[PDB]
Each structure stands twice: as C-alpha cells, then as structure tokens.
Amino acid sequence: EKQVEIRKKIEYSMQLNASRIKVLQAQDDLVSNMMEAASKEVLNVSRDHNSYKKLLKGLIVQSLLRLKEPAVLLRCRKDDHHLVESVLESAKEEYAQKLQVHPPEIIVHHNAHGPSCSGGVVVASRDGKIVCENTLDARLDVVFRKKLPEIRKQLVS
C-alpha cells in the first residue's frame, strides 16, 4: 500500500501540473489575442492618410540621423508611395536642421504587400549592407516585449 499510494500521489501531481499549465496556456493565448488586436489596430492606423504622413517623415528623419550615412536607399509600400514621394526632401531638410550637414541622396521603386509592409520605411545604406528597418509592423512587437511586464502588472485579476 505504501509503494502504491505513491502512484496516487503521482496522479494528483500530474493533474495539478496539467491544470496549471492549461491556465498558463490560456494566459498566453490571451496575450497572443492582444498582440493580434494590436496588429489590427496598427493596420487601422495605417489606413489613415493625412496625419499618417508626419509619422513617416519623423521615421525617415530619425533613421537618417541614427544611421549618419552620406547616401541611403529607402523603400516604401505602394500605398503612401505618393505620400513618401510628396514628403521627399523635406525630411532631408529637417535632418539638415537637426544637425548642420548637406542632405544626402534619397532614392525610392519596389514595394512590399500592403498589409505585410504596414507602412514604415526601410532607409538602409549604400549597397544595402547596413539596414535601419522601421516598418510599423516591425516597430510593433519591439514595443511588445518592452511593455509585456507592464501588461502582466496590468493583468491583476
């Protein structure tokens, strides 16, 4: 009986482990649903046109600054390709204002799929050796891991 009741104890332990791991699986599924909702909302933001442009200009300026390259090769989605062609060298002028320098050459064209690209800019460098990738879809899921502890704090009950 002593060596058999260990089997009952093992069964209880297995049941408890299965229950708690199922609970954790539900938690992770909720987290994944949150990520999917965030992606859908990011696409909805990408649907914007007018105010959506200023964010692209800011992305281009910050990428050019942090790259500090003399010539880059930027690629954009077909959606807002007119918008990026409109912003054009205004971002270069803004960068020259941020740091006194001669604006580099900017070249725009192939596009990724609309939903796949989800806007953003891939400024990159000459010969594509160095890439500063700033797609909003990629900008998200970078914020996600940073904010995950904050979310776990938010999930109190």
């Binding site: 699986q25 910050q62 500090k68 160095i130 890439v131 990738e133 502890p149 776990r152």
Partner: protein, 463 residues
C-alpha cells in the same frame, strides 16, 4: 519616455574563423550586446560580441559557425546584454540550456526582465547563514551540517551515484520545521548531462509530486557548448528573483560542475586566452566565484539562497584545478568515497574530508544538542586515528594492534558499518542518530577521549 528604436540589421560580416564571426563598419556597437544572427538559409542563432574595436566587432555565436556565408548572413544588434524573463510562474516547469521552454508549455510571461550576470549583493548587506536544512539524509545533518544560506558542494568521481544522491536530496528536501508557501523552492540546474540521466531526472521529479515547487534547467551534451555556460547563470538569476525579490527560500542544485569547467576551457581555448593550470583559463577563479558567490541571506529580505553544487574529480584527484578552485571558494565540501562504494554502501560518504565550515553556526540552542560539536569532533578525529591503526596493522600484522589500536580499528569498522549507512529514503532524525554516534564514541574508553571534555557528553544521557 525617450522614443523607441528598432534594432540595426547589418550584413558586413568580413571574416569568419573558429567560433568567431567578425563584423565591420558597425555604427555604434555595444559590448556584450546580444546579437541574433540570421543565415542565408533563413535559420537563426544567437551569440555574444566579446570584443569591440573601432567599427569592428568580434562575435562568438552560440549554435556554431558552420554554414555561414561572408556575403549572405545578416547580423542584428539588440543593443542589450542577455536578459532572462524571470517570473513567479516559472515554477514547476523545465527549460533548455538557453532557457527556452521544453515542458510542452507556453513561454514564460515575464513579471520583469532581469539582466543575468547580476551585480553583487553589497558586502555590508550580506548576513551570515544561521538555520539548519533538513535535506532528508542522516549523515549530512548529523555531521557536516548545512545552513540555510551556506554553500557546500558534493565531491564525487565518475561512476558514483552522486546524481541519485542529488535526486534524493531534491525530493526529500525540506525545512527543519522545528510555511509551505514560502518553503524550499528548488531550482535544479543541469550543466551537460547524458540523455538517459536527463530522462531519469525528468521522471524522478515528475513522479515525486515536488513538481509543484521545482524548476529544472536541463542542458544535454548535444546542446551547443557555449549554451552550457549561460545555464548556471540563468538558473542563479531565477533563484535570485525567487528568493530575494519573491521571498521563498531556494535550494539551488548544479550538476556536473566539472562539465561547466570543461565548457569554460573549450570556450577559452577557442578564444585563445592565457591558460592556467591544466590549460584551464586563468580567470576561472573569477567565473566560478561569479557562480558560487551568490547564495546567501540578504538582510533587507527574508529570502535565502542555498548552493549545493556537484563536482566530479576528473582523474579522481582532488588536486585537479576545478576541485582546487571550488574548495578555495565554496566554504566546505561533502566527500564521497569510491572505496566505500566498492564496500556496497549506498551513501558512500567519506567522513574524513567531509567538513562544513559554517557548521559552528548551524549548531546552536535552537536546534541540535549541546554535545553536537564535541560528538562531531570526536567522530571526525578518531576515524583518522583508526585509519592510521588499520594502516599500521596492514604494514606489520594483526598482533600489531595493541589494546588501544584495536579499539580504534573496531571503532572504524563499526562506524563504517552502522552510522554511515542509511536507507534510500531514510529521514533518520538527529537525536536517534546521535545516540548511536555517542555509542560509537563510547566504544573507545570514556576517559581516554582527549579533545572532548567528559562533562559535555555528560550533559547528554545514555538511554
């Protein structure tokens, strides 16, 4: 908050040799920045940047350098040191050497990211270990005891049952209780074990019912060798989070400490560094210190980390560099005898080198008896004299053992027979064992005893 930034993606790998990938034209590197290299085939692997110079950056990958092309592999700079997502939910699960889940469960939802290789506890803040631990083995609690915060390893050569001993200790572990929510939360590092031993550990922990409070960190030999070195770091990071920032006491177990040392020697030799003894890296004292010198009781918090590593004398020689550095750092040792194992003793602990440097504080008035120290001293000293008597008998003959030597030999024989031996699940409590310990001490004359005063044992009473 300062605006976010997305990681740089480079492709300027300009030379590969050994386990090192050399980059160039890097804009703003960072020392020990974790990089996740993606090859041309699309597979990914990680690595550390061990040196930064100019625009160059030397990266030592994790999964090996095989199949890397100087014109198609892409390197990405996360811009941060290695961080393990420690959380309270990590209990009752298993992880690979790098910490990836392997328990067929979801990845850990972190409460907070904590950079591994954490800063040292302020030395002033650290406090001395004061409470004994009920490991569930007699011979450890009776003599060469353990304090809740004291580090002590298990010395055991190849082929010995030390892994089974570790499993028994982990399953039989518990506080003295002389509660359960803050009780021992065992973390079980596994640095380079065989697949059969890994299955042994998994089954033993799952069936034991202790899986409700135990986290494993399994790392097989088939895993990349560098991934072996970060394992006993991630394990200690999780232990620190659970003990100091979460409260519950932790009894960390490291297996195959020699395997970690081998992992260090291989990595250092790849790095082409200055060699210490036996070709081991010179700074191994520092890197064994960074592992060992973490267990302890911080004052501001009620947690406690206790360290019980297991070594393996390579040539069955305690003079090997790994046990030498360990014995320098680790505050005592428990020794396992091959000869006693040959004598068919399941717990083959050799008491002659088995000493606990913190046993003086483990004993006291809260626990043990007033004669515990004296009994330990006598049963630790007379054993050596009995061994010398046995040697003299061997080199001369049976008649050489005089009326005093014969008593020492009989004491040694009865000690090796009765006291040391124990059952595979024997929770022999301290008093019942100390009774027969004093019986062994009284096999020798009650007045011939030199070091002990008779009054100390006279405080105790036979029967």
């Amino acid at each position: 908050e300062g605006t976010l930034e997305v990681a740089m993606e480079y492709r300027t790998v300009t030379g590969v040799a050994g386990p090192l990938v050399i980059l160039d034209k890097v804009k703003g590197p960072k020392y020990y920045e974790i990089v996740n290299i993606r090859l041309g085939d699309g597979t990914m692997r990680r690595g550390q940047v061990l040196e930064v110079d100019g625009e160059k950056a030397v990266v030592q990958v994790f999964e090996g350098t095989s199949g890397i092309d100087n014109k198609f592999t892409t390197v990405q700079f996360t811009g941060e040191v290695l961080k393990t997502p420690v959380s309270l939910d990590m209990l009752g699960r298993i992880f690979n050497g790098s910490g990836k889940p392997i328990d067929n469960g979801p990845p850990i939802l972190p409460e907070a990211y904590l950079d591994i290789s954490g800063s040292s506890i302020n030395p002033s803040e650290r406090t001395y270990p004061e409470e004994m631990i009920q490991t569930g083995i007699s011979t450890i609690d009776v003599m060469n005891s353990i304090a809740r915060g004291q580090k002590i390893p298990l010395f055991s050569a190849a082929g010995l049952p030390h892994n089974e001993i570790a499993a028994q200790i982990c399953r039989q572990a518990g506080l003295v209780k002389r509660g359960e929510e803050d009780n021992f939360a065992i973390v079980f590092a596994a640095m380079g074990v065989n697949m059969e031993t890994a299955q042994f550990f998994k089954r033993d922990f799952e069936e034991n019912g202790s899986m409700e409070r135990v986290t494993l960190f399994l790392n097989l030999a088939n895993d990349p060798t560098i991934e072996r070195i970060i394992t006993p770091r991630i394990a200690l990071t999780t232990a620190e989070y659970l003990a100091y920032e979460c409260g519950k006491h932790v009894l960390v177990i490291l297996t195959d400490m020699s395997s970690y040392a081998d992992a260090l020697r291989e990595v250092s030799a790849a790095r082409e560094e200055v060699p210490g003894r036996r070709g081991y890296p010179g700074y191994m004292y520092t890197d064994l210190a960074q592992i060992y010198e973490r267990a302890g009781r911080i004052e501001g918090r009620k947690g406690s980390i206790t360290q019980i590593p297991i070594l393996t004398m390579p040539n069955d020689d305690i003079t090997h560099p790994t046990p030498d550095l360990t014995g320098y750092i680790t505050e005592g040792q428990i020794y396992i005898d091959r000869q006693l194992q040959n004598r068919q003793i399941y717990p083959p602990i050799n008491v002659l080198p088995s000493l606990s440097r913190l046993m003086k504080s483990a004993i006291g008035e809260g626990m043990t008896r007033r004669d515990h120290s004296d009994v330990s001293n006598q049963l630790y000293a007379n054993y050596a004299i009995g061994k010398d008597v046995q040697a003299m008998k061997a080199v001369v003959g049976e008649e050489a053992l005089s009326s005093e030597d014969l008593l020492y030999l009989e004491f040694l024989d009865k000690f090796e027979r009765k006291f040391v031996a124990q059952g595979a699940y024997d929770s022999r409590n301290i008093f019942q064992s100390l009774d027969l310990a004093w019986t062994l001490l009284r096999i020798f004359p009650r007045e011939l005893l030199h070091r002990i005063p008779g009054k100390t044992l006279d405080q105790y009473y036979s029967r």
